[PDB]
Every structure is written in C-alpha cells, then in structure tokens.
Amino acid sequence: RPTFYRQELNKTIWEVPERYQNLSPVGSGAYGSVCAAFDTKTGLRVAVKKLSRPFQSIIHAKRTYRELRLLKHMKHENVIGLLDVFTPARSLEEFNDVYLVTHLMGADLNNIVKCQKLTDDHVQFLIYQILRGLKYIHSADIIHRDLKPSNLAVNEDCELKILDFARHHRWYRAPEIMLNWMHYNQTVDIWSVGCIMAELLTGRTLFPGTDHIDQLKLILRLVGTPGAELLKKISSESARNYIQSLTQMPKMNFANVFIGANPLAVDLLEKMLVLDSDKRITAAQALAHAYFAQYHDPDDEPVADPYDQSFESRDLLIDEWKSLTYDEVISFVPPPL
Ligand SMILES: CC(C)Cn1ncc2cc(Cc3ccc(F)cc3F)c(C(=O)NCCN(C)C)cc21
Ligand SMILES: Fc1ccc(-c2n[nH]cc2-c2ccncc2)cc1
C-alpha cells in the first residue's frame, strides 16, 4: 500500500498517494470534483476525479459501482480508460471515498469549436475517432447516451477520447428521447455524432432548442415530419396525435442547408440524421463511409470484450453495493506501462 497525503482544494478534501503531485482543480459538479495532477511514477499528467458522496444512498452506491465497472472495462485509444483507482481507507469498514485516474487531455471540444472553425480535414479526423470509439462501445452493448462537445477531449496532436458516459442506465439528443420512447437503440449516439459533425462544419449549434417541444420542432424542420413507415412504429397515443396534427413539413435538402461543405460530409450527415432509428447508419457502417477514406483501416477498428451488465437489474443494499465496489478497487490491475 502506498502513502497518502492530505490537502484542501476549494472546499473539498483530497487524500491521494504521493505519486500524484501538484493537484490543481479543474471543475466540480454532480459528477464529483476533478483535479489535474502529475504522476511521478509514470511522468504523465493525469486527471483525478473524487466521487461525490459515493455511498450516501442506494442510487449513489449503484452509480458508483456502475462507473467503476465501465471504466475498468474500456480499453481503447479513443475511449477514456482507468490508469488507477484508489481509496485512502484501509478496510471495508472505513471505505468511504473513491478516486479515479486517467490521462489528462489538452482540452474539450467545446473549447476548440468556438475558438476556431475547423477545416474539413480536422472534422474528418475528429469524427472518425468518435466513431471508432463508438464502434468499440457499441460492440459491448453499451450506449453513451450523452455524447456532446463537452464530453469529448482532444490533445494538441488532435487525438480524441470519449469521456464520461451518461450514467442514466438538450441540443444533441435523439428525437426519440424527446418523444420519451423507452426502447431507443444504440443509434441515439449516432444522432449525437451527426449534431456534433454539423456544428464543427458550420460553427453553429444545429438544434439549439429551449425545451423538449421546441427541440423537436427544430429537428422536424430539417428532416421533415415522419412518414407513414415511421408513424406505424409509434405506440404512444399522445405522440401519434401530436405528430399527425403538426403542420407537415418536407425534408430539406442537406446540400442546400450545408452549402460549401464537402459533398461526402453532406452525404454522411444525411445517413446520420435520419428520424427513423432503424434506418440510421451505424458506427461500424459509418467508419467505412468514403468521407473517412483518408483514415479508415478495417484491421485497426477493434471491438470490445463482452461486458456483463446483469447487475443493472439488481436491488441491493447500500452496504452490498459498497462491498461490490471495494472488491473492484482491490482487484484493479494497472495497464502495462
Ligand atoms: C477537460 C480536460 C480536463 C480533459 N480531461 N482529460 C481527462 C479527463 C477526465 C475527466 C473526468 C474523469 C473521468 C475518469 C477518471 F478516471 C478521472 C477523471 F477525472 C474530465 C472532467 O473533468 N470531466 C467532468 C465531467 N463533465 C465533462 C460532464 C476531464 C478530463
Ligand atoms: F417525430 C418523431 C421523431 C422520432 C421518432 C422515432 N424515431 N425512431 C424511433 C422513434 C419512435 C418514437 C416514439 N415512439 C416510438 C418510436 C418518431 C417520431
């Protein structure tokens, strides 16, 4: 066991091993508190997240267990991974805090898009990496659910990583969630990617809606009201009525909306921003799209080992979720240096 040291940043107490030095806050919220730090054992700059009240309730305890399982499983260049997880506690009895460690990235995508407009080649490489990481995540039957510029981090090399999965198990959310459809599939993420790609090409949020209703009407204005094939798939009575009563609007021509953009980019957006989720393009299929010929390599777009999410359906006590989390802390194995 290593030796810990203690200090106060903002109003948070931080107890971490000596190897992590020069902690400086990065931000805080419901997710907990994040600090940038230097790892003397490896020489890397790292990001340390201290979970907030990890075992204060059953919802928190399960959430803590969920995040740790996910991060321990992700082993992919475009997905955030676990460098280390530790607790200052020496036993299950005193186990009360969990810290997570990962490589520090240069900036989030929301600090690039507004600082600069992106060339078509940059958009190619950035979107390509998101999809490469999404293919991996989706191969494990995991849905991110909250893909958005602030959840994508980039290095000065333009290397990208997907961060902070939505622990749910807004301008970027698929319309079937605005309609509250409880059976949305993994292509909800592909919709998010489409809204992101469009924003990089134009510099403007594609669907800057003020609420759920306003959001949907901005989406239908671009992709048009749903056809009869999609009408036949809606079970909700209120939804069906709301949609059949809206003044009908045609699908606009993306080539005209996105004038001057690479025609291969326009084509990909049209395959991503499809209202009917069954017809939306998949991450695996989008990687083979001609827009990414510069970067596509079918022997270097790997898939993930099978991920067991059976715990999601379990109804346990706080002490049981806590103990299961402790087990995952102890059995952690750092990645090969
Ligand atoms: C913006 C730069 C600091 C780039 N950067 N690089 C790595 C990294 C990790 C995090 C969060 C995080 C996740 C796993 C982990 F084990 C340790 C962690 F710290 C955050 C962050 O602060 N996320 C806040 C939550 N928001 C986005 C919803 C930011 C990160
Ligand atoms: F206006 C819309 C927008 C999106 C959808 C939709 N796309 N994929 C699945 C659905 C959907 C929505 C609600 N109920 C069932 C299915 C249906 C109508």
Residue numbers in the entry: 5 to 173, 186 to 353
Quoted passage from the original study:
Inhibition of butyrylcholinesterase (BChE) and p38α mitogen-activated protein kinase (p38α MAPK) offers an innovative dual approach to mitigate two major drivers of neurodegeneration in AD: cholinergic deficit and neuroinflammation. Using structure-based drug design and a library of known p38α MAPK inhibitors, we developed first-in-class, selective dual BChE/p38α MAPK inhibitors with balanced activity against both targets.
Compounds 94 and 95 showed balanced submicromolar inhibitory potency against hBChE and p38α MAPK, while they did not inhibit AChE at a concentration of 100 μM, which was also one of the main objectives to diminish potential side effects. The KINOMEscan assay showed that off-target inhibition was limited only to structurally related kinases (p38β MAPK, JNK1/2/3, and CDK3) and was absent at 1 μM, where only p38α MAPK was inhibited among the 103 kinases tested. The 2,4-difluorobenzene sits in HR I defined by Ala51, Lys53, Leu75, Ile84, Leu104, Thr106, and Leu167. The optimal distance of 7.9 Å between the hydrogen bond donor on the indazole core (i.e., the N 2 nitrogen of the indazole) and the 2,4-difluorobenzyl group allows exquisite selectivity toward the structurally and phylogenetically most related kinases. The amide group is critical for effective inhibition of p38α MAPK as it acts as a hydrogen bond donor interacting with Asp168 of the DFG pocket (3.2 Å for compound 94 and 3.6 Å for compound 95). The brain-to-serum AUC ratio was 1.58 for compound 94 and 0.83 for compound 95, indicating a higher brain penetration of compound 94.
